[PDB]
Design a protein around this ligand. Structure first.
Ligand SMILES: C[C@@H](c1ccccn1)N1C[C@H](CO)[C@H]2CCC[C@@H](C1=O)N2S(=O)(=O)c1cc(Cl)cc(Cl)c1
Length: 133
C-alpha cells in the first residue's frame, strides 16, 4: 500500500512540477531545472564525473549529500540510476542542475526500501565539477 500511495504522490508531484517555471520535461519523463549553467564539456556514457550533490524526497527530506563532507563524489556515468546517466550527459561541466526523477528512472517498484521506498520520486541538486575520459 505504501507502494500505491508513493506512486500517487509521485505522479501528482511530477504533474504539478512540469508546469513550474524553469522545469524542462524530457521524453523519458525526467524533468530538470538549470540552477547555474557551466561552459565545460558534456560527459559521455563511458566517462567518469566528479560531482557535488544532494538527494531529497518530495517532502524535502535529504537522504544523501556531499555537503560539509570536505570532498566531491566520483561516478562512472553509466553505473548510476538511469535519471543520473541521462541528466549527466546533457550537463556542461561547471553546471548545477536540479533533476526530478520518476521512480522508473531510479529504483522503481522496489518492493523493499529503506532510504528509498517503493515508487519513490527523487529530487537531486547536481553540480558537475569535472569530466574524465
Ligand atoms: C551507485 C548507486 C547505488 C549504489 C548502491 C545502492 C544503491 N544505489 N547510487 C547511489 C549514489 C551514492 O553512491 C547516489 C548518487 C548517484 C545516484 C544514486 C545512485 O545511483 N544515488 S542516490 O542518492 O540515489 C542514493 C541511493 C541509495 Cl539507495 C542510497 C544512497 Cl545513500 C544514495
Amino acid at each position: 500500500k505504501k507502494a500505491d500511495e508513493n506512486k500517487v504522490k509521485g505522479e501528482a508531484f511530477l504533474t504539478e512540477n512540469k508546469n513550474k517555471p524553469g522545469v524542462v520535461v524530457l521524453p523519458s519523463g525526467l524533468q530538470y531545472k538549470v540552477i547555474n549553467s557551466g561552459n565545460g564539456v558534456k560527459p559521455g556514457k563511458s566517462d567518469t564525473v566528479t560531482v557535488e550533490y544532494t538527494g531529497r524526497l518530495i517532502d524535502g527530506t535529504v537522504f544523501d549529500s556531499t555537503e560539509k563532507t570536505g570532498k566531491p563524489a566520483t561516478f562512472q556515468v553509466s553505473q548510476v540510476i538511469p535519471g543520473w546517466t541521462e541528466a549527466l550527459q546533457l550537463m556542461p561541466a561547471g553546471s548545477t542542475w536540479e533533476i526530478y526523477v520518476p521512480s522508473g528512472l531510479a529504483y522503481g517498484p522496489r518492493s523493499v526500501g529503506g532510504p528509498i521506498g517503493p515508487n519513490e520520486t527523487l529530487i537531486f541538486k547536481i553540480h558537475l565539477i569535472s569530466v574524465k575520459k
